[PDB]
Amino acid sequence: AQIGPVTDLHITNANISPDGFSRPAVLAGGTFPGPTIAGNTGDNFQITVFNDLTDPSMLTDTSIHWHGLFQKGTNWADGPAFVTQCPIITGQSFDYNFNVPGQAGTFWYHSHLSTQYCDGLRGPFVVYDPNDPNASLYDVDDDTTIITLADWYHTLAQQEPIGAAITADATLINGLGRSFTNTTASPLSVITVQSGKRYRMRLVSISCDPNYLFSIDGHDMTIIEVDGVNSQQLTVDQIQIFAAQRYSFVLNANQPVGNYWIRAQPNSGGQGFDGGINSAILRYEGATVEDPTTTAPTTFSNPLVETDLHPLADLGVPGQPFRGGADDPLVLNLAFANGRFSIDGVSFVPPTVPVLLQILSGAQNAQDLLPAGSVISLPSNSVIEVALPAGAAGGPHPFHLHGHNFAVVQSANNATPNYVNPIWRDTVSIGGTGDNVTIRFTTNNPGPWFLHCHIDWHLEAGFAIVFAEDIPDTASANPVPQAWSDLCPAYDQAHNISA
Ligand SMILES: *[C@@H]1O[C@H](CO)[C@@H](O[C@@H]2O[C@H](CO)[C@@H](O[C@@H]3O[C@H](CO)[C@@H](O)[C@H](O)[C@@H]3O)[C@H](O)[C@H]2NC(C)=O)[C@H](O)[C@H]1NC(C)=O
Ligand SMILES: *[C@@H]1O[C@H](CO)[C@@H](O[C@@H]2O[C@H](CO)[C@@H](O)[C@H](O)[C@H]2NC(C)=O)[C@H](O)[C@H]1NC(C)=O
Ligand SMILES: [Cu+2]
Ligand SMILES: [Cu+2]
Ligand SMILES: [Cu+2]
Ligand SMILES: [Cu+2]
């Protein structure tokens, strides 16, 4: 069952063995991935998060972010630790009480403290549209049509040794999959369809790092949604999906009753499908209970290319149709050296006082805000352009902006911008060396919004800045509940921090 929009959510430690290897984890709702939180567009979500964590090897504090939800007027509920709140301490709870006006689509929730989401605190978050303009394109859309793609590690996130390369040990599709080394024939996930029906498959990357080449043998996939944004129908036979991105696609169960491999090839870790790694099963009702015998092509016919996507609605692009044609045109210098990432020369290290609390306490320019050089002000009611030229090691980097979606004026691997009808989304690959992926949005949401690479290891290593949007209006726009005001005193007491 789906839970929400008003629900408790307990965060616990437990052992799990999703690939046959047992390790402790950080779980929401007792499972990996966590249960789906759901409601309808415009609903009030009240997710009362109970931190019941006791194992310090995965951190006993926590904070949860609702990825892709704009949090307008509720910046305090956004979740990034030391940006919008202090963490929740063990044995305490906190009500994330917010609304989702004007949004409907496929989202997710995840820990936003350290690398803790890698240890298991990740799950789907769906905002249904009772009047969905895409409703007639499919018959079935429910918890059974959500497909999560996850990287899973045997080594605990906090225990990844300094100086050694980090790669995963298994790809998990809907929570199950097989280990790349010492592979055992542990159970694979099964997605069941009925011949003749059409399904809204909600594809969610809950990855901490790799991108996946996702396909389903024998089938093609008609994209209708991109990171919460309805798209024109785009038929593809493979989707390269980066960390934290989502797509809805229509799956027409139009092949012979049988079993078909579902494939999710990460860009690192195990290559191929030997022993059933990187795999799940699409099973038609009435098929034999047995593994598929299908193969992939050598070369896919119609891979997703981001410039092929266009909004369903007439969203256009704000600003003027040329580089720098915005009220506040930015170009970020994104770099890596010596184990740390930097943006404009500054590596992100979370501050002691959350940025939002610093603003509410009266710090009103971004040069006043800590960490110094990591907080950049944005003016209100303005068109912002952010160029994100690639080149930094560890690419391709998926960059994500809290509080907003954005027009992708320039995509990876294509030097031509699009000022007419590009897709809008919230997480974008910035591509490869020489690329100039560029985003645009308008500032109508006062508060500090994190901009960061969504490879969690890179975030931890400093690949982030905070956009302090409309500092002057942040306090009036975001009244805070007493429970939020209580978070930093409780956290600092528990941790013996003075501030
Ligand atoms: C590289 O990115 C650019 C920019 O997003 C892509 O260019 C765009 O290509 C589309 C598809 O060919 C062009 O639109 C089509 O325009 C014709 C009018 O000539 C119209 O008949 C069709 O209905 C269709 O919409 C679009 O004008 C063009 N935009 C720009 C700014 O050049 C390009 O396709 C990408 N390259 C690759 C290899 O995908
Ligand atoms: C990416 O695009 C931005 C503009 O959106 C380019 O920025 C210009 O950079 C040059 C120097 O490299 C400056 O003289 C201009 O003031 C910048 N802004 C403009 C022209 O609008 C940037 O060079 C591009 N980067 C790459 C790697 O292609
Ligand atoms: Cu987010
Ligand atoms: Cu996120
Ligand atoms: Cu990165
Ligand atoms: Cu984030």
Coordinates of C-alpha atoms and ligand atoms in Angstrom, one line a residue:
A1 CA 0.0 0.0 0.0
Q2 CA 0.8 3.6 -0.6
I3 CA 0.8 5.9 2.4
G4 CA 0.0 9.6 2.8
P5 CA -0.7 12.3 2.2
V6 CA -0.9 12.4 6.0
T7 CA 1.2 9.7 7.6
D8 CA 3.8 8.7 10.1
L9 CA 7.1 7.5 8.7
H10 CA 9.6 5.7 11.0
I11 CA 13.3 5.6 10.2
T12 CA 14.9 2.5 11.6
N13 CA 18.0 0.4 11.3
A14 CA 17.6 -3.2 10.1
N15 CA 19.4 -5.9 8.2
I16 CA 18.5 -6.5 4.6
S17 CA 19.8 -8.8 1.9
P18 CA 18.4 -7.4 -1.4
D19 CA 21.1 -9.2 -3.5
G20 CA 21.6 -12.1 -1.1
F21 CA 24.4 -10.3 1.0
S22 CA 23.2 -9.2 4.4
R23 CA 24.1 -5.8 5.7
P24 CA 22.6 -3.2 8.1
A25 CA 20.7 -0.3 6.6
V26 CA 18.8 2.9 7.2
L27 CA 15.1 2.3 6.2
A28 CA 11.9 4.3 5.9
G29 CA 8.9 2.2 6.6
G30 CA 10.9 -1.0 7.2
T31 CA 11.7 -1.6 3.6
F32 CA 14.1 -0.9 0.7
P33 CA 13.1 1.1 -1.1
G34 CA 10.8 2.8 1.4
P35 CA 7.0 2.8 0.9
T36 CA 5.5 5.1 -1.7
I37 CA 4.2 8.4 -0.3
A38 CA 1.3 9.6 -2.4
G39 CA -1.5 12.0 -2.8
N40 CA -3.2 14.3 -5.3
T41 CA -2.1 17.6 -6.8
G42 CA -2.6 20.4 -4.3
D43 CA -2.9 18.1 -1.3
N44 CA -1.5 18.9 2.1
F45 CA 1.2 16.4 3.0
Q46 CA 2.0 15.9 6.7
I47 CA 4.8 13.4 7.0
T48 CA 5.6 13.0 10.6
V49 CA 9.1 11.5 10.5
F50 CA 10.1 9.4 13.6
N51 CA 13.9 9.1 13.9
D52 CA 14.4 5.7 15.6
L53 CA 18.0 5.2 14.5
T54 CA 20.4 3.7 16.9
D55 CA 23.4 2.5 14.8
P56 CA 26.0 5.3 14.6
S57 CA 27.8 3.6 11.7
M58 CA 25.1 5.0 9.4
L59 CA 24.5 8.2 11.5
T60 CA 21.7 8.4 14.1
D61 CA 20.6 11.8 13.0
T62 CA 18.4 12.2 9.9
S63 CA 16.7 14.8 7.6
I64 CA 14.4 14.0 4.7
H65 CA 13.9 15.9 1.4
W66 CA 11.0 15.7 -0.9
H67 CA 12.8 15.7 -4.2
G68 CA 11.3 17.9 -6.9
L69 CA 8.6 19.5 -4.7
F70 CA 8.9 23.2 -4.7
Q71 CA 8.1 24.0 -1.0
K72 CA 6.9 27.5 -1.8
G73 CA 6.3 29.2 1.5
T74 CA 7.6 26.1 3.4
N75 CA 11.4 26.3 2.7
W76 CA 11.8 25.0 6.3
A77 CA 10.3 21.7 5.2
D78 CA 12.7 21.1 2.3
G79 CA 15.1 18.8 4.2
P80 CA 18.8 19.5 3.1
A81 CA 20.8 19.4 6.3
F82 CA 22.3 22.7 7.3
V83 CA 20.6 24.4 4.4
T84 CA 17.0 24.5 5.6
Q85 CA 17.2 22.7 9.0
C86 CA 19.3 21.0 11.6
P87 CA 18.9 17.2 11.5
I88 CA 16.2 15.4 13.6
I89 CA 17.9 13.6 16.5
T90 CA 17.2 10.0 17.5
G91 CA 14.2 9.5 19.6
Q92 CA 12.5 12.6 18.3
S93 CA 10.1 13.3 15.4
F94 CA 9.2 16.1 13.1
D95 CA 6.2 16.9 11.0
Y96 CA 7.1 17.9 7.4
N97 CA 3.8 19.8 6.7
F98 CA 3.7 21.2 3.2
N99 CA 1.4 21.5 0.2
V100 CA 1.9 20.6 -3.5
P101 CA 0.0 23.3 -5.5
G102 CA 0.5 23.2 -9.2
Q103 CA 2.6 20.0 -9.3
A104 CA 1.6 16.5 -10.4
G105 CA 4.0 13.8 -11.4
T106 CA 6.7 11.4 -10.2
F107 CA 9.0 12.4 -7.4
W108 CA 11.0 10.7 -4.6
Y109 CA 12.1 11.2 -1.1
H110 CA 15.5 10.6 0.4
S111 CA 17.8 11.4 3.3
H112 CA 19.5 14.7 2.8
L113 CA 22.2 14.3 5.5
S114 CA 25.7 13.2 4.5
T115 CA 25.6 10.1 2.3
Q116 CA 22.9 8.5 4.4
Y117 CA 20.4 7.9 1.5
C118 CA 22.9 5.5 0.1
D119 CA 22.5 3.4 3.2
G120 CA 18.8 2.9 2.3
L121 CA 16.6 6.0 3.1
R122 CA 15.0 6.4 -0.4
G123 CA 11.6 5.8 -1.7
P124 CA 9.0 7.0 -4.4
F125 CA 6.7 10.0 -3.9
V126 CA 3.8 10.3 -6.4
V127 CA 1.5 13.2 -6.8
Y128 CA -1.4 12.0 -9.0
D129 CA -3.6 14.3 -11.2
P130 CA -7.3 13.6 -11.1
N131 CA -7.6 15.5 -14.4
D132 CA -4.3 14.3 -15.9
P133 CA -4.1 15.4 -19.5
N134 CA -2.3 12.1 -20.2
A135 CA -5.0 9.9 -18.6
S136 CA -6.4 8.5 -21.8
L137 CA -3.0 7.2 -22.9
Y138 CA -3.0 4.2 -20.4
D139 CA -5.2 1.9 -18.4
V140 CA -3.2 1.2 -15.2
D141 CA -1.2 3.6 -13.0
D142 CA -0.7 2.5 -9.4
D143 CA 1.9 1.2 -7.0
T144 CA 2.5 -1.8 -9.2
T145 CA 3.7 0.4 -12.2
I146 CA 6.4 2.2 -10.2
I147 CA 9.9 1.1 -11.2
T148 CA 12.8 2.1 -9.0
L149 CA 16.5 1.8 -10.1
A150 CA 19.0 1.8 -7.3
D151 CA 22.7 1.3 -6.7
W152 CA 23.5 -0.9 -3.7
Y153 CA 26.8 -1.2 -1.8
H154 CA 28.1 -3.8 0.5
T155 CA 30.4 -1.3 2.3
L156 CA 28.5 1.2 4.5
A157 CA 28.5 4.8 3.2
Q158 CA 30.4 6.3 6.1
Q159 CA 32.9 3.4 5.9
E160 CA 33.9 4.0 2.2
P161 CA 37.6 4.4 2.6
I162 CA 39.3 7.7 1.9
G163 CA 41.3 7.5 -1.3
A164 CA 39.7 4.4 -2.9
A165 CA 37.3 4.3 -5.8
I166 CA 33.6 3.9 -4.9
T167 CA 31.5 1.6 -7.0
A168 CA 28.4 -0.3 -6.2
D169 CA 27.9 -4.0 -5.7
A170 CA 24.5 -4.6 -7.2
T171 CA 21.8 -2.9 -9.3
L172 CA 18.4 -3.2 -7.6
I173 CA 15.2 -2.9 -9.6
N174 CA 12.2 -2.5 -7.3
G175 CA 14.5 -3.5 -4.5
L176 CA 15.9 -6.7 -5.8
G177 CA 18.9 -7.7 -8.0
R178 CA 22.1 -9.7 -8.1
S179 CA 25.6 -8.9 -6.9
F180 CA 28.3 -8.1 -9.5
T181 CA 30.8 -10.3 -7.8
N182 CA 30.1 -13.5 -5.8
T183 CA 26.9 -13.5 -7.8
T184 CA 24.1 -15.6 -6.3
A185 CA 20.8 -16.5 -7.8
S186 CA 18.8 -14.4 -5.4
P187 CA 15.3 -13.4 -6.4
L188 CA 14.7 -10.9 -9.2
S189 CA 11.8 -8.5 -9.3
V190 CA 8.9 -9.2 -11.4
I191 CA 6.7 -6.6 -13.1
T192 CA 3.4 -8.1 -14.2
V193 CA 1.3 -6.9 -17.1
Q194 CA -1.9 -8.2 -18.9
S195 CA -1.8 -8.7 -22.6
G196 CA -3.7 -5.8 -24.3
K197 CA -3.5 -3.2 -21.5
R198 CA -1.4 -0.1 -21.4
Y199 CA 0.6 0.9 -18.3
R200 CA 2.0 4.2 -17.0
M201 CA 5.4 3.0 -15.8
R202 CA 6.8 5.6 -13.4
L203 CA 10.6 5.1 -13.7
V204 CA 12.5 6.5 -10.7
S205 CA 16.2 6.7 -10.4
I206 CA 17.0 6.6 -6.7
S207 CA 20.7 6.3 -7.4
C208 CA 23.5 7.6 -5.3
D209 CA 25.8 7.6 -8.3
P210 CA 25.4 5.6 -11.6
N211 CA 23.3 6.4 -14.5
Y212 CA 21.4 3.5 -16.1
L213 CA 20.7 2.5 -19.6
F214 CA 17.2 1.2 -19.1
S215 CA 15.3 -1.0 -21.7
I216 CA 12.8 -3.8 -21.9
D217 CA 13.4 -6.5 -24.4
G218 CA 10.8 -6.6 -27.1
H219 CA 9.1 -3.4 -26.1
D220 CA 9.4 0.3 -26.6
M221 CA 8.5 3.1 -24.2
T222 CA 6.5 6.2 -24.9
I223 CA 7.7 9.0 -22.6
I224 CA 4.9 11.3 -21.2
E225 CA 6.5 12.9 -18.2
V226 CA 10.0 14.1 -17.4
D227 CA 10.9 15.0 -13.7
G228 CA 7.3 16.0 -13.0
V229 CA 6.7 17.8 -16.3
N230 CA 4.3 16.5 -18.7
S231 CA 5.8 15.9 -22.2
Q232 CA 4.7 15.3 -25.7
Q233 CA 4.7 11.6 -26.4
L234 CA 8.2 10.5 -27.4
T235 CA 8.8 6.8 -28.3
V236 CA 12.2 5.3 -27.4
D237 CA 13.6 1.9 -27.0
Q238 CA 16.3 2.8 -24.3
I239 CA 16.4 5.5 -21.7
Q240 CA 19.7 6.8 -20.2
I241 CA 18.5 7.9 -16.8
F242 CA 20.7 9.9 -14.4
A243 CA 20.7 9.9 -10.6
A244 CA 17.5 11.4 -9.3
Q245 CA 15.7 11.8 -12.6
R246 CA 12.2 10.4 -13.3
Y247 CA 10.2 9.5 -16.4
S248 CA 6.8 8.2 -17.0
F249 CA 6.4 6.0 -20.0
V250 CA 3.6 4.2 -21.5
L251 CA 4.2 0.4 -21.8
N252 CA 1.9 -1.3 -24.2
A253 CA 1.6 -4.9 -23.4
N254 CA 1.5 -5.8 -27.0
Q255 CA 4.0 -8.6 -27.3
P256 CA 3.3 -12.3 -27.1
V257 CA 2.4 -13.5 -23.7
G258 CA 5.8 -14.4 -22.2
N259 CA 8.8 -13.3 -20.1
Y260 CA 11.0 -10.3 -21.2
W261 CA 14.1 -9.0 -19.6
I262 CA 14.1 -5.6 -18.0
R263 CA 17.6 -4.2 -18.3
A264 CA 19.3 -1.4 -16.2
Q265 CA 23.0 -1.1 -17.1
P266 CA 24.9 1.2 -14.8
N267 CA 27.8 3.3 -16.1
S268 CA 30.1 1.8 -13.4
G269 CA 30.1 -1.5 -11.6
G270 CA 29.1 -4.7 -13.3
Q271 CA 28.9 -4.6 -17.1
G272 CA 26.5 -6.9 -18.9
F273 CA 23.9 -9.3 -17.5
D274 CA 25.8 -12.5 -16.7
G275 CA 24.0 -14.5 -14.0
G276 CA 21.1 -12.1 -14.1
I277 CA 22.8 -9.0 -12.8
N278 CA 21.4 -5.6 -13.9
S279 CA 18.1 -7.4 -14.6
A280 CA 14.4 -7.8 -13.7
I281 CA 11.5 -9.6 -15.4
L282 CA 8.5 -8.4 -17.3
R283 CA 6.0 -11.2 -17.0
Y284 CA 2.7 -11.3 -18.8
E285 CA -0.3 -12.9 -17.0
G286 CA -0.5 -16.5 -18.2
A287 CA 3.2 -16.8 -19.0
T288 CA 5.2 -19.7 -17.6
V289 CA 7.1 -18.8 -14.4
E290 CA 10.6 -19.0 -15.8
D291 CA 13.3 -16.5 -16.7
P292 CA 13.1 -14.7 -20.1
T293 CA 15.1 -16.0 -23.0
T294 CA 15.2 -12.6 -24.8
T295 CA 18.2 -10.6 -25.8
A296 CA 18.9 -6.9 -26.3
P297 CA 19.9 -5.6 -29.7
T298 CA 23.5 -4.8 -30.3
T299 CA 22.5 -1.2 -31.1
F300 CA 19.3 0.4 -29.9
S301 CA 17.1 2.0 -32.6
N302 CA 15.7 5.0 -30.8
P303 CA 17.6 5.9 -27.7
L304 CA 16.3 8.9 -25.7
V305 CA 18.1 12.1 -26.6
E306 CA 17.1 15.0 -24.3
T307 CA 16.7 17.6 -27.1
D308 CA 13.9 15.3 -28.5
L309 CA 11.7 15.9 -25.4
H310 CA 9.3 18.8 -25.4
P311 CA 6.7 20.0 -22.9
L312 CA 3.1 19.0 -23.3
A313 CA 2.0 22.5 -22.3
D314 CA 3.3 25.7 -24.0
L315 CA 6.0 26.4 -21.4
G316 CA 8.4 28.3 -23.6
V317 CA 11.6 29.7 -22.2
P318 CA 11.9 32.8 -20.0
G319 CA 14.3 35.6 -21.1
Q320 CA 15.7 36.4 -24.5
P321 CA 16.8 33.9 -27.1
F322 CA 20.6 34.1 -26.7
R323 CA 23.3 33.3 -24.2
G324 CA 23.2 35.7 -21.3
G325 CA 19.7 36.8 -22.3
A326 CA 18.5 36.9 -18.7
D327 CA 18.2 39.3 -15.8
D328 CA 20.8 37.4 -13.8
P329 CA 23.0 35.4 -16.2
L330 CA 25.5 33.1 -14.4
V331 CA 28.3 30.8 -15.5
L332 CA 29.6 28.5 -12.8
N333 CA 33.2 27.2 -12.7
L334 CA 32.7 23.6 -11.7
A335 CA 35.9 21.8 -10.8
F336 CA 37.5 18.9 -9.0
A337 CA 40.9 18.5 -7.5
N338 CA 42.6 16.5 -4.7
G339 CA 39.4 14.7 -3.6
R340 CA 37.2 17.9 -3.4
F341 CA 34.8 19.5 -5.8
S342 CA 34.3 23.2 -6.0
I343 CA 32.0 25.8 -7.5
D344 CA 33.6 29.2 -8.3
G345 CA 36.6 28.1 -6.3
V346 CA 34.7 27.1 -3.1
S347 CA 34.1 23.6 -1.9
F348 CA 30.8 23.2 0.0
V349 CA 31.2 22.2 3.7
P350 CA 27.9 22.4 5.6
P351 CA 27.7 25.3 8.1
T352 CA 26.9 24.9 11.8
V353 CA 23.8 27.2 11.6
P354 CA 21.5 26.3 8.7
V355 CA 21.4 28.9 6.0
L356 CA 17.7 29.5 6.5
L357 CA 18.2 30.1 10.2
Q358 CA 21.0 32.5 9.5
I359 CA 18.6 34.5 7.2
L360 CA 15.8 34.4 9.8
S361 CA 18.2 35.7 12.4
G362 CA 18.9 38.8 10.2
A363 CA 21.8 38.0 8.0
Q364 CA 20.7 39.7 4.8
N365 CA 23.3 39.5 2.2
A366 CA 24.8 36.5 0.8
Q367 CA 28.3 37.7 1.5
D368 CA 27.2 37.7 5.3
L369 CA 26.0 34.0 5.0
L370 CA 28.0 31.0 5.9
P371 CA 29.7 29.1 4.4
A372 CA 31.5 32.1 2.9
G373 CA 31.5 31.9 -0.9
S374 CA 29.0 29.1 -0.9
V375 CA 25.8 31.2 -0.8
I376 CA 24.9 33.3 -3.8
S377 CA 21.9 35.7 -3.8
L378 CA 19.3 35.7 -6.5
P379 CA 17.1 38.7 -7.1
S380 CA 13.3 38.3 -6.9
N381 CA 11.0 38.1 -9.9
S382 CA 13.9 37.8 -12.3
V383 CA 15.0 35.5 -15.1
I384 CA 18.0 33.4 -14.0
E385 CA 20.3 31.6 -16.4
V386 CA 22.9 29.2 -15.1
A387 CA 25.5 27.8 -17.5
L388 CA 27.1 24.6 -16.1
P389 CA 30.1 23.8 -18.3
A390 CA 31.3 20.2 -17.8
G391 CA 34.9 18.9 -17.5
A392 CA 35.2 18.1 -13.8
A393 CA 36.3 14.5 -13.1
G394 CA 33.7 11.9 -12.3
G395 CA 31.2 12.9 -14.9
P396 CA 28.6 13.0 -16.3
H397 CA 27.4 15.0 -13.4
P398 CA 23.6 15.3 -12.8
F399 CA 22.9 18.7 -11.4
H400 CA 19.7 19.4 -9.4
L401 CA 18.1 22.6 -8.1
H402 CA 15.8 22.5 -5.1
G403 CA 12.7 24.8 -5.0
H404 CA 12.4 24.8 -8.8
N405 CA 12.3 23.1 -12.1
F406 CA 14.0 24.8 -15.1
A407 CA 14.1 25.0 -18.9
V408 CA 17.1 23.0 -20.2
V409 CA 18.2 25.5 -22.8
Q410 CA 21.2 23.4 -23.7
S411 CA 21.7 19.7 -23.2
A412 CA 24.6 17.3 -23.1
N413 CA 26.5 16.5 -26.2
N414 CA 24.9 19.1 -28.4
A415 CA 26.2 22.6 -28.7
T416 CA 23.0 24.1 -30.0
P417 CA 20.7 25.9 -27.5
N418 CA 16.9 25.8 -27.6
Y419 CA 15.1 29.0 -26.7
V420 CA 11.8 27.8 -28.1
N421 CA 10.5 24.5 -26.7
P422 CA 13.1 22.6 -24.6
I423 CA 12.0 20.3 -21.9
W424 CA 11.7 21.5 -18.3
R425 CA 13.0 19.3 -15.5
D426 CA 14.8 19.3 -12.1
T427 CA 17.9 17.2 -12.6
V428 CA 20.0 17.4 -15.7
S429 CA 23.2 15.7 -16.9
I430 CA 25.8 18.4 -17.6
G431 CA 27.5 16.1 -20.1
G432 CA 31.0 15.8 -21.2
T433 CA 34.1 17.9 -21.8
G434 CA 33.4 21.0 -23.8
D435 CA 29.6 20.9 -23.2
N436 CA 27.7 23.9 -21.9
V437 CA 24.5 22.6 -20.4
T438 CA 22.5 25.6 -19.4
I439 CA 19.3 26.1 -17.4
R440 CA 16.8 28.9 -16.9
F441 CA 14.0 29.7 -14.4
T442 CA 12.3 32.7 -12.8
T443 CA 12.6 33.6 -9.2
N444 CA 9.2 33.4 -7.6
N445 CA 10.0 31.3 -4.5
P446 CA 11.9 33.1 -1.7
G447 CA 14.3 30.9 0.3
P448 CA 17.7 29.2 0.2
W449 CA 17.7 26.5 -2.5
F450 CA 20.4 24.0 -2.8
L451 CA 22.1 23.5 -6.2
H452 CA 24.2 20.4 -6.3
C453 CA 25.5 17.3 -8.1
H454 CA 23.2 14.4 -7.3
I455 CA 26.0 11.8 -7.2
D456 CA 25.9 11.7 -3.5
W457 CA 29.6 11.0 -3.1
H458 CA 30.3 14.2 -5.0
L459 CA 27.8 16.3 -2.9
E460 CA 29.7 14.9 0.2
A461 CA 33.0 16.0 -1.5
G462 CA 31.6 19.6 -1.9
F463 CA 29.9 19.8 -5.3
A464 CA 27.2 22.3 -4.2
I465 CA 26.2 25.9 -3.7
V466 CA 23.1 27.5 -2.2
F467 CA 21.0 30.0 -4.1
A468 CA 19.6 32.4 -1.5
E469 CA 16.6 33.5 -3.5
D470 CA 15.0 36.8 -2.5
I471 CA 16.7 37.1 0.9
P472 CA 14.6 40.1 1.8
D473 CA 11.3 38.3 1.6
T474 CA 12.5 34.9 3.0
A475 CA 11.2 35.5 6.5
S476 CA 7.8 36.9 5.6
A477 CA 7.3 34.2 2.9
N478 CA 8.3 31.2 5.1
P479 CA 6.8 31.4 8.6
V480 CA 8.3 28.6 10.7
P481 CA 6.6 26.2 13.2
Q482 CA 7.8 25.9 16.7
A483 CA 9.0 22.3 16.0
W484 CA 11.3 23.6 13.4
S485 CA 12.7 26.3 15.7
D486 CA 13.3 23.6 18.2
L487 CA 15.5 21.5 15.9
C488 CA 18.8 23.3 16.1
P489 CA 18.8 23.7 19.9
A490 CA 18.0 20.0 20.3
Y491 CA 20.7 19.0 17.8
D492 CA 23.4 21.2 19.1
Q493 CA 22.7 20.1 22.7
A494 CA 22.8 16.4 21.7
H495 CA 26.1 16.9 19.8
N496 CA 27.7 19.4 22.3
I497 CA 27.9 22.2 19.7
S498 CA 28.0 25.9 20.7
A499 CA 26.5 28.6 18.3
Ligands
LIG1 C1 20.7 19.5 -31.1 O1 19.9 20.4 -30.3 C2 19.1 21.2 -31.2 C3 18.4 22.3 -30.3 O2 17.5 21.6 -29.3 C4 18.2 20.4 -32.0 O3 17.6 21.3 -33.0 C5 16.3 21.3 -33.2 O4 16.0 20.2 -34.0 C6 14.6 20.1 -34.2 C7 14.4 18.7 -34.9 O5 14.9 18.7 -36.2 C8 14.0 21.3 -35.0 O6 12.6 21.3 -35.1 C9 11.8 20.7 -36.1 O7 11.8 22.0 -36.8 C10 11.2 21.8 -38.1 C11 11.3 23.1 -38.8 O8 12.5 23.1 -39.6 C12 9.7 21.5 -37.9 O9 9.2 21.1 -39.1 C13 9.5 20.3 -37.0 O10 8.1 20.3 -36.5 C14 10.4 20.2 -35.8 O11 9.9 20.9 -34.6 C15 14.4 22.6 -34.3 O12 14.1 23.7 -35.1 C16 15.8 22.6 -33.9 N1 16.1 23.8 -33.0 C17 17.2 24.5 -33.2 C18 17.3 25.7 -32.2 O13 18.1 24.3 -34.0 C19 18.9 19.3 -32.7 O14 18.0 18.4 -33.3 C20 19.8 18.5 -31.8 N2 20.6 17.6 -32.5 C21 20.4 16.3 -32.5 C22 21.4 15.4 -33.4 O15 19.5 15.7 -31.9
LIG2 C1 28.9 28.7 -21.7 O1 28.0 29.8 -22.0 C2 28.3 30.9 -21.3 C3 27.2 32.0 -21.5 O2 26.0 31.4 -21.2 C4 29.7 31.5 -21.8 O3 30.0 32.6 -21.0 C5 30.7 33.6 -21.5 O4 32.1 33.3 -21.3 C6 33.1 34.2 -21.9 C7 34.5 33.8 -21.5 O5 34.6 32.3 -21.7 C8 32.7 35.7 -21.3 O6 33.6 36.6 -22.0 C9 31.2 36.1 -21.4 O7 31.0 37.2 -20.6 C10 30.3 34.9 -20.9 N1 28.8 35.2 -21.1 C11 28.2 35.5 -22.3 C12 28.9 35.6 -23.6 O8 26.9 35.5 -22.5 C13 30.8 30.4 -21.5 O9 32.0 30.7 -22.2 C14 30.3 29.1 -22.2 N2 31.3 28.0 -21.8 C15 31.7 27.1 -22.6 C16 32.6 26.1 -22.0 O10 31.3 26.9 -23.7
CU3 CU 15.6 18.3 -4.5
CU4 CU 17.6 15.2 -4.5
CU5 CU 29.0 14.8 -9.7
CU6 CU 19.0 17.8 -3.0

